[PDB]
Amino acid sequence: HAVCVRHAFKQYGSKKNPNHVLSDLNMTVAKGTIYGLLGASGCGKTTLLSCIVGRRRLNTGEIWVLGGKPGTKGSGVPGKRVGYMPQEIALYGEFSIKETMMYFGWIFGMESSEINERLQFLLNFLDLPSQNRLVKNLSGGQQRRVSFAVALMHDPELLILDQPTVGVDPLLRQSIWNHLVQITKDGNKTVIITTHYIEEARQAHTIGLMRSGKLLAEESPHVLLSMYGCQSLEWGKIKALLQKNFLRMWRNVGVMLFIFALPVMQVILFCLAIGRDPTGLKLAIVNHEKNYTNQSYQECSFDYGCKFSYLSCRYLNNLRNSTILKEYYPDPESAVDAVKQGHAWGALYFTENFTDALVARMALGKDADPETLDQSEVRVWLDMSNQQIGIILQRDLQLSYQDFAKDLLGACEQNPDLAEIPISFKEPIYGSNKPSFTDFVAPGVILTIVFFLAVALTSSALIIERMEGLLDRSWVAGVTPGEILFSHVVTQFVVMCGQTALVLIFMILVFGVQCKGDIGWVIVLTILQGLCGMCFGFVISAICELERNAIQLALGSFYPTLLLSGVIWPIEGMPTVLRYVSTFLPLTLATTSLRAMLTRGWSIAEPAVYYGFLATIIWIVAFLTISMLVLRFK
Amino acid sequence: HAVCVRHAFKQYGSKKNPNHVLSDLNMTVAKGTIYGLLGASGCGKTTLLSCIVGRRRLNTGEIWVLGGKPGTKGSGVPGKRVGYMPQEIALYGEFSIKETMMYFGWIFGMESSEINERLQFLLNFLDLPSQNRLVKNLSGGQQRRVSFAVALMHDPELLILDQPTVGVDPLLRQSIWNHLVQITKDGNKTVIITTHYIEEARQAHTIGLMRSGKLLAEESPHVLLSMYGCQSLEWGKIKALLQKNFLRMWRNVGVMLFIFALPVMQVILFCLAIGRDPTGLKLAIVNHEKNYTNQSYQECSFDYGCKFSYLSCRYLNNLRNSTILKEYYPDPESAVDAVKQGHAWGALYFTENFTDALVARMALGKDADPETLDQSEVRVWLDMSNQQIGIILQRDLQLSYQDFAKDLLGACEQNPDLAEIPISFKEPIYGSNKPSFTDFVAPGVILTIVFFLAVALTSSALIIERMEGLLDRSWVAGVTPGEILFSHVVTQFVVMCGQTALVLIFMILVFGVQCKGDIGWVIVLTILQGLCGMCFGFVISAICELERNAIQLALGSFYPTLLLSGVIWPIEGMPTVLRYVSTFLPLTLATTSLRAMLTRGWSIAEPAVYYGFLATIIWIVAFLTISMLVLRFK
């Protein structure tokens, strides 16, 4: 007995509308007989064959196949001893015949020098073109004959052919039916071929017949006649599914080269845009001591030395000569009317009696009457509608006043240290005295460019299996569903490391970013975050089913992981509850650890550093068990 | 007459290794005869039928069908007068039988009350289940029968069928072949049916035959059997494809509600995390005037009033009671050893004779000597390894010294105004005197949340057509390429406006981003900017065939948008070449216009405002013609 089923009960639909496809289904396939499962279009015929190879659970029946229940250690449904053929052509369209016969070649442990020893024989038996032609340009009949040879070469001992002769001319159909009757001559193989052409089914030995949810009769075709009628009929698996993932990238070279040009482009833009201070902003200076001529011109022939003359046009040219452009107006009421409509960013005003009011405010002290302490002031109106240019504009006018004040003392009377606020900031312990925005955000972006590029790579990898077919007919071949996932991790970790190192080269070597700490541990962490990123793209593909429903889910996680992590604002700005929640995240703790390597210089031994590795290894495992659990569930 | 081909030529293979599928191909279909195109498996049979309906173009030949070549206004190829059944079942599996009959119903201009009668008649004729059962839930023989009732209901005058009776039992295949005879009794319609089931092909009366790229015979069967052998001779279209787009968003309500929760979640996080001043951060204060006890106690009593005693403790409690914690150490060499290992963010130092050296500095004035200069300084070491917290700490110790200085002159007898540098900043013309980082990035993130969400929506739309079929046999039913794209804009612009207004409500009304200029124009710009985003996602789908290149291309074009538009840094730091290029972009000219509406208050009439509308309406047209040119001709 090859297959034997007792008391089979299956049905789809809700309890309010039962279907009742199968009712009893008591049959027995004697070993060595070409069992033929004929029937009527509409009954449960494929749903029985699909219940034999363990594709659908039988819902409280008894099924015994080649030793035991399907999918159990005592039977042989998944393995090299069971042939198969689906109703629809489940073949990958981008493979040549010589490649699709090797993908299934060494899944069943066939030697590479033995597959092609019979590939030519199979191509000669059933007519087929040259073996280098991809199976997408093949006709509709030469695509069925390939599927009949893919799952016949390994010489199984139980064939589950369903509709194998649909779409070929009668000569080829006779040739196909003249083969199942030759290999079965000895008691070694069984066939369960089912077809809808009953005339050709006379060659079988144990023709079955289904009428209503149960087998009607199972007798020889010439015994069926004269009783019911009168006349006529009334390492292998890993290596196999790893040269298919690698071959996929090579098939469309040109877009695979694009993914290697993304990190270099995304890093060049960041270094060339963010951080550099503005250098092309203007001002409206209306100094009322020099006669107003032209628009971009005014005399500045002040006195150079201990003689204090024309102090107004000495504070000018004492500020930055490159980040501020000077423009002159004759009327204070007109300068404010120039910044108002957007022709400048500010407007100064030096009163007519400025030098006298300032030379009498330093020599005289603590006796400054309000009249004297009202004309020595440099009135400035700022267009503070940008909150980032006005901040450096008002940080430059008064910082440049320090040089103006120190120049007075250091040239005439005393040591250039009186004009200093008593608070002295010494030398910073870790950083520099001139912080830059491009250095606070750089360590948090390198860990983010890598994370998102890895997510986009492995975002549809687990979802294209249904796209190309070849999946549900490879489950029968014994492919463990934890074995496809492993081959995706290996086949993409090679290409992820190729662009992770591209970010580091173009951000540390070409563009200067300090690396006071150890360089070995930075690389380990920056690929521990990429691998965590690509494992996050598997919990999306497994959960999602529709292709369009998974693009906008990973893409919808761009901003929330760019704000919740500390990238552009310190993590201490959030309230006391969001800050606590935003610590158990994949990226919020790696930026803090990497910031303590590039700038401070701490090694791994420091407690604040190894938390990044500890809190990113956990997420790798967490994103893997969930992805595996969903895959194993269905 | 009905169809005639003269001197047809077509080859598939590359140059110097041709295929030569067709050589001459001279045939003629009569006025009302059931032409049957039989032949061997491997010749050009489907590629001839697929060249009649205009799916493939001949190389050098003349094809003349229903009075003119395909694609000419005089010929009815892409019309309601041509039936068409493909070799493979090109049906959408998510539609019920009634829905998929109505979708093809009113493409040809069929009244909704007239389709139902034909639907019931066809369901009665060829056995089929209840009309509200999904096609994907049907069997393999009840899915072919549905496809037979779609290419037959509108009553065409030229039926084209290739293998319409495969996978169905003979008792019903005879019924199918018994229908093409009844409807063709008069000289109204023609049938061009190709089958490999030669036994039942004797019912026709113009059987053809192909051997190698040429028609062999075109005679009647019972004449063929007696010639050289004995036996075995070997508004509707828009309405149609718009209740199908509106329907696929109703079968996944679980995820359709998710896309309405992204904008509220992505805006709540931005306003709750970015902008707030850090509040929890410590200091190491080692004041050498009060005895050191505990570690959170310093006995701060400083003789409140005009009397000048314990000035060190007067400066303390004058910084901030909220944003700075205080921790006290007894040794200057130990405070630096606390900030060094991360237990603080700074370390002050008040010398044991601080008050005496400060009460004498404001009296001697210009007569100060270096002995008393370097004894009244609040030495502070700062951990500037964050560059964002150190800035607000360096800007708080000295800004709070202004209060300490004014607390002295304004205490006993003086006017609290001789403590300011001669630079006075007056009142800002447009902004406020206390700029915030959150108010600078908010007008420019709203334009980015909308842009990115629209791209995610309409980026898999044009590549999902090939997934569910219904496109090979939609081009035949007079569906021009223009109106497929148009119906993808109306069906998503409704759902994009539903989340564009969600961003505005949750950013202006609830969280409180000010808007001085005009609320009418902001909504127009933020809607007409999102529409530019959704049109950009169409150019991604038009030029990308494989779906795996859509997630990677769309998600990989995000960082080059934040870093190249002025979202987080004003566009003046880039070099001259990059700054000039960046203005000709969809977003960099629109954030500037929106920033001049919320902050300045300018209306549209200002010339710096309508450039945003003008420079993003162009991109809508530019992204549409390219998305249409590729879609029309490939």
Ligand SMILES: Nc1ncnc2c1ncn2[C@@H]1O[C@H](COP(=O)(O)OP(=O)(O)OP(=O)(O)O)[C@@H](O)[C@H]1O
């Ligand atoms: N896209 C293609 N590119 C190249 N060659 C092709 C392509 N499609 C088909 N061919 C080849 O050109 C010929 C066209 O075959 P065609 O589709 O007409 O066969 P058919 O009569 O439908 O086949 P069958 O009855 O065996 O299913 C065949 O030799 C086929 O191998």
Ligand SMILES: Nc1ncnc2c1ncn2[C@@H]1O[C@H](COP(=O)(O)OP(=O)(O)OP(=O)(O)O)[C@@H](O)[C@H]1O
């Ligand atoms: N996924 C499904 N959900 C519900 N009912 C289904 C499903 N698949 C098939 N059926 C129904 O189960 C019954 C048996 O289908 P089955 O696939 O066994 O038919 P079959 O013998 O292969 O058909 P045929 O030869 O006519 O193509 C049919 O009534 C079919 O409509």
Ligand SMILES: [Mg+2]
């Ligand atoms: Mg079947």
Ligand SMILES: [Mg+2]
């Ligand atoms: Mg065909």
